[PDB]
Amino acid sequence: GVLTIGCREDSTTFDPIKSAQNRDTWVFANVYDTLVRVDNLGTKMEPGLAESWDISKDGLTYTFKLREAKFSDGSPITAEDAAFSLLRIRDNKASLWSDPFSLINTAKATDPKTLVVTLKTPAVAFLSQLASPTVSILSEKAMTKMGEDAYAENPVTSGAFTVDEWRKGDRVILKKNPNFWQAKNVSLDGVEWVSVTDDNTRMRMVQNNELDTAIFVPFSRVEELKKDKNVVIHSDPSTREDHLLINHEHGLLAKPEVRQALDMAIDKQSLVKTATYGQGTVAYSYIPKGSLYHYANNLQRPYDPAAAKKLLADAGAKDLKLNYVVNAGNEADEQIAVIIKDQLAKVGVTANLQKVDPTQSWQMLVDGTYDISVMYWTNDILDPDQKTTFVLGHDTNQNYMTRYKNDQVKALVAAARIEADPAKREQMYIDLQKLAKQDVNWIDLYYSPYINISRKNVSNFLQNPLGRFTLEEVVKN
């Protein structure tokens, strides 16, 4: 009656505004609910806490009509709760998501059922923006009774589940929230996210019935696990992209040329086909294929070890040594690093692999104690602004911890967001994909579907294109 999910990185918080990591957002996307949601197919917005909403001509006022719906503890979910949840993303100091939410003049609830939001400038991305798990309706009353620190360990929740117990680093145990306004549709009695950092171990736990489901199926095992009759491999359309991060404030990695040389010394074809076993598709743009404004003809630098040696030598960077942070137990990461190390040695670049606990590598990216490291990004919304801001906006996240700094790009990101001409807006994200590619913000690696595993008695274990799991629709037989 309780569904266990093997995962890799583990929960750090339950306050959406202080985490930019799927280890939290894929967990609490089922713990809270949002005003707006996205369908399973990831093609449109559908109603959530707000049963309907309307837009003024000027395009600066969003009015939301709220349905009758209660929190985890019984109290009602009012538009004053939503107003408070939006506002703290823009205003709380600890917010990792403020920059796109500074476009907000006010969030106010006239009525308990009514939420009125006034922006400084139109922004078509805003409705889409509300679907993201970061803007999850919280309880103003409970956080203003408990405090923001204590809330993030035992939250009062608006979604299908509550955090029953949380053994840090080990497993998050969720209980079905009967006060959830769609609790009648939820078969499951609880969810357990169980952190298993080694991919093989996580796969054997599923096959050995120690886990009902698992995310992040090692690519090497997809073909054999697709013929295993006791389990089901999911391959869901995604907004996922993997990239090699570059610390631009680490010496000669600051030079575009040097980054360019590394981009040219890494054979994407052979790397994607070997590390991903043909599950991957070579990435050439930071906006994932199939997502809004993706630019199919973005530059792919051909593999050219000769031109990379020359760029490096001209840049005074001939004996470039790099600290390449690797997530141990992550098969793709390990495999990619081996390939990358081998290819870089051919242009005279020494990648040293520092293998680290996968749960720990993100903090090393924030503190910048790395030269290169592989990471991934998945969209939480149906608009390009979320990733553009995190990766290129020069917000508190320092462009996915790369510390890439380009003033034209920083300006273009804000203007792309504000632009109301849909055709010109699309053109600004094409320029962003070209600019990021020219400056080598990071090295684009591959697009891949979400590949997951479930035991055959588990039904509707779908991950949606935005990374949200339909755990409300799951049936355990």
Short mmCIF file of all heavy atoms in Angstrom, two decimals, residues 88-138:
data_model
loop_
_atom_site.label_atom_id
_atom_site.label_comp_id
_atom_site.label_asym_id
_atom_site.label_seq_id
_atom_site.Cartn_x
_atom_site.Cartn_y
_atom_site.Cartn_z
N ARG A 88 7.02 35.48 -1.10
CA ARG A 88 8.29 35.10 -0.50
C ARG A 88 9.31 34.58 -1.52
O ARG A 88 10.50 34.51 -1.19
CB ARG A 88 8.06 34.06 0.61
CG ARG A 88 7.37 32.80 0.16
CD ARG A 88 7.05 31.90 1.34
NE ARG A 88 8.14 31.86 2.30
CZ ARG A 88 8.99 30.85 2.44
NH1 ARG A 88 8.89 29.77 1.65
NH2 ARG A 88 9.96 30.92 3.35
N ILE A 89 8.93 34.28 -2.74
CA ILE A 89 9.95 33.85 -3.68
C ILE A 89 10.72 35.09 -4.14
O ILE A 89 11.92 35.07 -4.28
CB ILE A 89 9.37 33.11 -4.89
CG1 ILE A 89 8.42 32.02 -4.43
CG2 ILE A 89 10.50 32.51 -5.71
CD1 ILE A 89 7.45 31.62 -5.50
N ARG A 90 9.99 36.15 -4.44
CA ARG A 90 10.60 37.40 -4.82
C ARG A 90 11.36 38.06 -3.70
O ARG A 90 12.46 38.56 -3.88
CB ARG A 90 9.55 38.38 -5.32
CG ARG A 90 10.12 39.74 -5.68
CD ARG A 90 9.18 40.85 -5.26
NE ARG A 90 8.87 40.72 -3.84
CZ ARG A 90 7.83 41.27 -3.25
NH1 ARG A 90 6.97 42.00 -3.96
NH2 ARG A 90 7.63 41.08 -1.95
N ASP A 91 10.76 38.05 -2.52
CA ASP A 91 11.31 38.75 -1.37
C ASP A 91 12.20 38.07 -0.33
O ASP A 91 13.01 38.75 0.27
CB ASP A 91 10.16 39.49 -0.67
CG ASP A 91 10.58 40.15 0.63
OD1 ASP A 91 10.89 39.43 1.61
OD2 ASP A 91 10.58 41.40 0.69
N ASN A 92 12.06 36.77 -0.09
CA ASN A 92 12.90 36.16 0.93
C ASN A 92 14.34 36.13 0.52
O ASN A 92 14.67 35.82 -0.61
CB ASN A 92 12.43 34.76 1.33
CG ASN A 92 12.89 34.35 2.70
OD1 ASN A 92 14.04 34.01 2.90
ND2 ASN A 92 11.98 34.36 3.65
N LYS A 93 15.20 36.45 1.46
CA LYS A 93 16.59 36.51 1.22
C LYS A 93 17.18 35.24 0.72
O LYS A 93 18.08 35.26 -0.06
CB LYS A 93 17.28 36.89 2.50
CG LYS A 93 16.87 38.25 3.04
CD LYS A 93 17.55 39.45 2.38
CE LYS A 93 16.63 40.68 2.21
NZ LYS A 93 16.29 41.44 3.44
N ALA A 94 16.71 34.14 1.23
CA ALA A 94 17.19 32.83 0.91
C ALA A 94 16.62 32.27 -0.36
O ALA A 94 16.78 31.12 -0.64
CB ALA A 94 16.82 31.92 2.07
N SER A 95 16.00 33.09 -1.15
CA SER A 95 15.34 32.59 -2.33
C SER A 95 16.31 32.45 -3.48
O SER A 95 17.02 33.40 -3.84
CB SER A 95 14.19 33.49 -2.75
OG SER A 95 13.50 32.87 -3.83
N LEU A 96 16.32 31.26 -4.08
CA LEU A 96 17.11 30.91 -5.25
C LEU A 96 16.37 31.19 -6.55
O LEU A 96 16.90 30.89 -7.62
CB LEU A 96 17.47 29.43 -5.19
CG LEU A 96 18.78 29.01 -4.53
CD1 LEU A 96 19.10 29.81 -3.29
CD2 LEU A 96 18.70 27.53 -4.23
N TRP A 97 15.16 31.72 -6.49
CA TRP A 97 14.28 31.85 -7.64
C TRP A 97 13.74 33.27 -7.78
O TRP A 97 12.72 33.48 -8.46
CB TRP A 97 13.12 30.87 -7.54
CG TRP A 97 13.59 29.46 -7.45
CD1 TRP A 97 13.70 28.68 -6.33
CD2 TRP A 97 14.01 28.64 -8.54
NE1 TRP A 97 14.16 27.43 -6.66
CE2 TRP A 97 14.35 27.38 -8.02
CE3 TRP A 97 14.11 28.85 -9.92
CZ2 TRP A 97 14.81 26.34 -8.83
CZ3 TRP A 97 14.56 27.82 -10.71
CH2 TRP A 97 14.90 26.58 -10.17
N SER A 98 14.39 34.24 -7.14
CA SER A 98 13.77 35.56 -7.02
C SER A 98 13.71 36.27 -8.36
O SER A 98 12.66 36.83 -8.71
CB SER A 98 14.53 36.39 -5.97
OG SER A 98 15.71 36.95 -6.50
N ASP A 99 14.78 36.22 -9.16
CA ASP A 99 14.91 37.09 -10.33
C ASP A 99 13.71 37.03 -11.28
O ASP A 99 13.26 38.10 -11.71
CB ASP A 99 16.21 36.77 -11.08
CG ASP A 99 17.24 37.85 -10.92
OD1 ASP A 99 16.92 38.87 -10.27
OD2 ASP A 99 18.36 37.69 -11.45
N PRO A 100 13.14 35.88 -11.56
CA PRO A 100 11.96 35.95 -12.42
C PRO A 100 10.74 36.47 -11.67
O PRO A 100 9.80 36.89 -12.27
CB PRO A 100 11.78 34.52 -12.84
CG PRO A 100 13.15 33.97 -12.79
CD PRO A 100 13.67 34.53 -11.54
N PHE A 101 10.78 36.47 -10.35
CA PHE A 101 9.66 36.92 -9.56
C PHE A 101 9.74 38.35 -9.07
O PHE A 101 9.05 38.75 -8.20
CB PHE A 101 9.32 35.99 -8.42
CG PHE A 101 8.67 34.75 -8.86
CD1 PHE A 101 9.39 33.63 -9.01
CD2 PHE A 101 7.37 34.73 -9.17
CE1 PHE A 101 8.81 32.48 -9.44
CE2 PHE A 101 6.77 33.60 -9.61
CZ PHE A 101 7.49 32.47 -9.75
N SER A 102 10.64 39.10 -9.62
CA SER A 102 10.77 40.49 -9.29
C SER A 102 9.89 41.35 -10.20
O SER A 102 9.73 42.50 -9.99
CB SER A 102 12.22 40.89 -9.39
OG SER A 102 12.83 40.27 -10.48
N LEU A 103 9.33 40.67 -11.19
CA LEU A 103 8.37 41.24 -12.12
C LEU A 103 7.03 41.43 -11.42
O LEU A 103 6.07 41.83 -12.04
CB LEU A 103 8.11 40.22 -13.22
CG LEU A 103 8.64 40.48 -14.61
CD1 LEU A 103 10.15 40.63 -14.60
CD2 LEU A 103 8.18 39.36 -15.52
N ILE A 104 6.98 41.14 -10.14
CA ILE A 104 5.75 41.22 -9.41
C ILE A 104 5.67 42.45 -8.56
O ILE A 104 6.53 42.68 -7.71
CB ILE A 104 5.66 40.03 -8.45
CG1 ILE A 104 5.46 38.74 -9.24
CG2 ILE A 104 4.53 40.25 -7.47
CD1 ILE A 104 5.82 37.50 -8.46
N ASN A 105 4.63 43.22 -8.79
CA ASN A 105 4.43 44.39 -7.99
C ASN A 105 3.72 43.91 -6.75
O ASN A 105 4.25 44.07 -5.66
CB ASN A 105 3.61 45.45 -8.70
CG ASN A 105 3.40 46.67 -7.83
OD1 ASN A 105 4.16 46.92 -6.91
ND2 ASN A 105 2.35 47.42 -8.11
N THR A 106 2.55 43.30 -6.89
CA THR A 106 1.85 42.83 -5.70
C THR A 106 1.11 41.53 -6.00
O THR A 106 0.64 41.29 -7.11
CB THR A 106 0.83 43.83 -5.16
OG1 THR A 106 0.17 44.48 -6.25
CG2 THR A 106 1.48 44.85 -4.24
N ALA A 107 1.02 40.71 -4.96
CA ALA A 107 0.08 39.61 -4.86
C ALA A 107 -0.85 39.93 -3.70
O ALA A 107 -0.39 40.19 -2.58
CB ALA A 107 0.79 38.27 -4.63
N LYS A 108 -2.12 39.93 -4.00
CA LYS A 108 -3.13 40.23 -3.05
C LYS A 108 -4.39 39.44 -3.34
O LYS A 108 -4.73 39.08 -4.44
CB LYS A 108 -3.40 41.74 -3.03
CG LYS A 108 -2.53 42.51 -2.05
CD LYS A 108 -2.70 44.01 -2.06
CE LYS A 108 -1.44 44.72 -1.61
NZ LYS A 108 -1.37 44.94 -0.14
N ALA A 109 -5.03 39.12 -2.25
CA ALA A 109 -6.25 38.44 -2.19
C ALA A 109 -7.21 39.37 -1.63
O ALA A 109 -7.05 39.83 -0.53
CB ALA A 109 -6.18 37.25 -1.29
N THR A 110 -8.14 39.73 -2.46
CA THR A 110 -9.25 40.52 -2.10
C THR A 110 -10.18 39.70 -1.25
O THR A 110 -10.60 40.06 -0.17
CB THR A 110 -10.00 40.83 -3.37
OG1 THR A 110 -10.22 39.62 -4.06
CG2 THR A 110 -9.16 41.63 -4.20
N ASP A 111 -10.37 38.50 -1.76
CA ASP A 111 -11.28 37.54 -1.26
C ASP A 111 -10.58 36.34 -0.90
O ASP A 111 -9.54 36.02 -1.45
CB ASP A 111 -12.11 37.10 -2.42
CG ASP A 111 -13.39 37.75 -2.47
OD1 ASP A 111 -14.30 37.27 -1.77
OD2 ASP A 111 -13.51 38.71 -3.22
N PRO A 112 -11.21 35.53 -0.07
CA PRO A 112 -10.62 34.27 0.31
C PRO A 112 -10.48 33.40 -0.91
O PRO A 112 -9.51 32.72 -0.98
CB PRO A 112 -11.64 33.69 1.26
CG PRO A 112 -12.35 34.86 1.76
CD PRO A 112 -12.50 35.73 0.58
N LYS A 113 -11.44 33.40 -1.83
CA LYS A 113 -11.38 32.63 -3.04
C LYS A 113 -10.61 33.35 -4.13
O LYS A 113 -10.38 32.80 -5.18
CB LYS A 113 -12.80 32.41 -3.51
CG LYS A 113 -12.98 31.39 -4.63
CD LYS A 113 -13.45 31.95 -6.00
CE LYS A 113 -14.83 32.62 -6.01
NZ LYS A 113 -15.13 33.52 -7.16
N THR A 114 -10.22 34.59 -3.91
CA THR A 114 -9.64 35.33 -5.01
C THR A 114 -8.22 35.80 -4.89
O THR A 114 -7.88 36.36 -3.95
CB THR A 114 -10.54 36.48 -5.36
OG1 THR A 114 -11.88 36.00 -5.43
CG2 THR A 114 -10.18 37.01 -6.65
N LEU A 115 -7.40 35.51 -5.85
CA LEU A 115 -6.01 35.97 -5.83
C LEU A 115 -5.79 36.93 -6.98
O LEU A 115 -6.03 36.58 -8.15
CB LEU A 115 -5.02 34.80 -5.91
CG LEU A 115 -3.55 35.25 -5.94
CD1 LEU A 115 -3.14 35.90 -4.63
CD2 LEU A 115 -2.62 34.10 -6.25
N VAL A 116 -5.33 38.13 -6.66
CA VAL A 116 -5.06 39.16 -7.66
C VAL A 116 -3.57 39.46 -7.62
O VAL A 116 -3.02 39.80 -6.57
CB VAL A 116 -5.89 40.43 -7.41
CG1 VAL A 116 -5.27 41.62 -8.14
CG2 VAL A 116 -7.34 40.21 -7.85
N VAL A 117 -2.91 39.32 -8.76
CA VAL A 117 -1.47 39.51 -8.87
C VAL A 117 -1.21 40.60 -9.90
O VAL A 117 -1.71 40.53 -11.03
CB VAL A 117 -0.76 38.20 -9.27
CG1 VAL A 117 0.67 38.48 -9.65
CG2 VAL A 117 -0.86 37.15 -8.16
N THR A 118 -0.44 41.62 -9.51
CA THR A 118 -0.15 42.75 -10.39
C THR A 118 1.34 42.79 -10.68
O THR A 118 2.16 42.91 -9.76
CB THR A 118 -0.61 44.07 -9.77
OG1 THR A 118 -2.04 44.11 -9.72
CG2 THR A 118 -0.14 45.25 -10.61
N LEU A 119 1.69 42.69 -11.96
CA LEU A 119 3.08 42.74 -12.39
C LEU A 119 3.47 44.16 -12.79
O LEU A 119 2.62 45.03 -12.99
CB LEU A 119 3.32 41.79 -13.56
CG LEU A 119 2.58 40.47 -13.65
CD1 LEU A 119 3.00 39.79 -14.93
CD2 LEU A 119 2.90 39.62 -12.44
N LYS A 120 4.78 44.37 -12.93
CA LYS A 120 5.29 45.65 -13.39
C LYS A 120 5.20 45.79 -14.91
O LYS A 120 5.14 46.92 -15.42
CB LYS A 120 6.74 45.81 -12.94
CG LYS A 120 6.95 45.42 -11.49
CD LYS A 120 8.35 45.76 -11.00
CE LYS A 120 8.44 45.58 -9.49
NZ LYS A 120 9.85 45.62 -8.98
N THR A 121 5.19 44.68 -15.63
CA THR A 121 5.26 44.64 -17.08
C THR A 121 4.64 43.32 -17.49
O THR A 121 4.83 42.33 -16.76
CB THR A 121 6.71 44.71 -17.59
OG1 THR A 121 7.41 45.78 -16.94
CG2 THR A 121 6.77 44.91 -19.11
N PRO A 122 3.92 43.25 -18.60
CA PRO A 122 3.43 41.94 -19.07
C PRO A 122 4.54 40.90 -19.16
O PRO A 122 5.72 41.24 -19.29
CB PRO A 122 2.83 42.26 -20.45
CG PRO A 122 2.45 43.70 -20.37
CD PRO A 122 3.41 44.36 -19.41
N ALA A 123 4.17 39.62 -19.08
CA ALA A 123 5.12 38.52 -19.18
C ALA A 123 4.36 37.21 -19.37
O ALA A 123 3.88 36.63 -18.39
CB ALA A 123 6.01 38.45 -17.95
N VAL A 124 4.26 36.74 -20.62
CA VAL A 124 3.45 35.56 -20.92
C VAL A 124 3.91 34.37 -20.10
O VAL A 124 3.11 33.46 -19.80
CB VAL A 124 3.50 35.26 -22.43
CG1 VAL A 124 2.30 34.40 -22.84
CG2 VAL A 124 3.54 36.56 -23.21
N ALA A 125 5.18 34.35 -19.69
CA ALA A 125 5.73 33.25 -18.91
C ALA A 125 5.12 33.13 -17.53
O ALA A 125 5.37 32.13 -16.85
CB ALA A 125 7.25 33.42 -18.78
N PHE A 126 4.31 34.10 -17.09
CA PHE A 126 3.96 34.13 -15.68
C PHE A 126 2.96 33.04 -15.31
O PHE A 126 3.14 32.33 -14.32
CB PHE A 126 3.42 35.51 -15.29
CG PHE A 126 3.45 35.74 -13.81
CD1 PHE A 126 4.64 36.07 -13.18
CD2 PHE A 126 2.31 35.55 -13.03
CE1 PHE A 126 4.69 36.26 -11.81
CE2 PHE A 126 2.35 35.74 -11.66
CZ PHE A 126 3.55 36.09 -11.05
N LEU A 127 1.89 32.90 -16.09
CA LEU A 127 0.95 31.82 -15.83
C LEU A 127 1.67 30.47 -15.82
O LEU A 127 1.48 29.65 -14.91
CB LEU A 127 -0.16 31.83 -16.88
CG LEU A 127 -1.09 30.67 -16.57
CD1 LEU A 127 -1.87 30.98 -15.29
CD2 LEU A 127 -1.99 30.38 -17.76
N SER A 128 2.50 30.23 -16.85
CA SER A 128 3.29 29.01 -16.88
C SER A 128 4.16 28.90 -15.63
O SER A 128 4.28 27.82 -15.04
CB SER A 128 4.16 28.97 -18.13
OG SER A 128 5.41 29.61 -17.90
N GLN A 129 4.68 30.03 -15.19
CA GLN A 129 5.51 30.00 -14.05
C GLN A 129 4.88 29.49 -12.81
O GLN A 129 5.53 29.03 -11.98
CB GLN A 129 6.15 31.33 -13.79
CG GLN A 129 7.34 31.53 -14.63
CD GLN A 129 8.02 32.81 -14.40
OE1 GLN A 129 7.41 33.82 -14.14
NE2 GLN A 129 9.31 32.78 -14.57
N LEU A 130 3.59 29.63 -12.65
CA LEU A 130 2.95 29.18 -11.45
C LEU A 130 2.82 27.69 -11.26
O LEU A 130 2.48 27.27 -10.25
CB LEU A 130 1.64 29.90 -11.26
CG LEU A 130 1.82 31.40 -11.43
CD1 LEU A 130 0.57 32.05 -11.88
CD2 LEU A 130 2.38 32.13 -10.26
N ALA A 131 2.98 26.93 -12.32
CA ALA A 131 2.97 25.51 -12.31
C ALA A 131 4.17 24.91 -11.61
O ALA A 131 4.11 23.88 -11.11
CB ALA A 131 2.81 24.97 -13.69
N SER A 132 5.28 25.62 -11.62
CA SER A 132 6.48 25.07 -11.03
C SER A 132 6.26 24.82 -9.56
O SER A 132 5.65 25.61 -8.88
CB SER A 132 7.65 26.03 -11.24
OG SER A 132 8.72 25.77 -10.36
N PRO A 133 6.85 23.73 -9.03
CA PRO A 133 6.83 23.28 -7.63
C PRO A 133 7.46 24.28 -6.66
O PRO A 133 7.15 24.23 -5.48
CB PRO A 133 7.61 21.97 -7.68
CG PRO A 133 7.30 21.44 -9.03
CD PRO A 133 7.28 22.64 -9.93
N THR A 134 8.36 25.13 -7.15
CA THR A 134 8.97 26.18 -6.37
C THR A 134 7.87 27.10 -5.86
O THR A 134 7.89 27.50 -4.70
CB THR A 134 9.89 27.01 -7.26
OG1 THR A 134 10.96 26.18 -7.74
CG2 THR A 134 10.46 28.17 -6.50
N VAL A 135 6.90 27.46 -6.70
CA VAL A 135 5.78 28.28 -6.24
C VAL A 135 4.62 27.40 -5.75
O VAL A 135 3.52 27.44 -6.28
CB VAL A 135 5.31 29.30 -7.29
CG1 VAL A 135 4.61 28.63 -8.45
CG2 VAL A 135 4.42 30.35 -6.65
N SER A 136 4.89 26.64 -4.69
CA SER A 136 3.93 25.74 -4.10
C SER A 136 3.22 26.49 -3.01
O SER A 136 3.85 27.19 -2.23
CB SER A 136 4.64 24.53 -3.50
OG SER A 136 4.75 23.48 -4.44
N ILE A 137 1.91 26.37 -2.96
CA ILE A 137 1.17 27.07 -1.94
C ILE A 137 1.50 26.51 -0.58
O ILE A 137 1.39 25.32 -0.34
CB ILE A 137 -0.33 26.98 -2.20
CG1 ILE A 137 -0.62 27.55 -3.58
CG2 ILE A 137 -1.10 27.70 -1.11
CD1 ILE A 137 -2.08 27.52 -3.94
N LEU A 138 1.95 27.37 0.31
CA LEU A 138 2.26 26.98 1.66
C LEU A 138 1.22 27.59 2.58
O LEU A 138 0.37 28.37 2.17
CB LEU A 138 3.62 27.48 2.06
CG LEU A 138 4.76 27.27 1.08
CD1 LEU A 138 6.02 27.88 1.66
CD2 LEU A 138 4.96 25.79 0.82
#
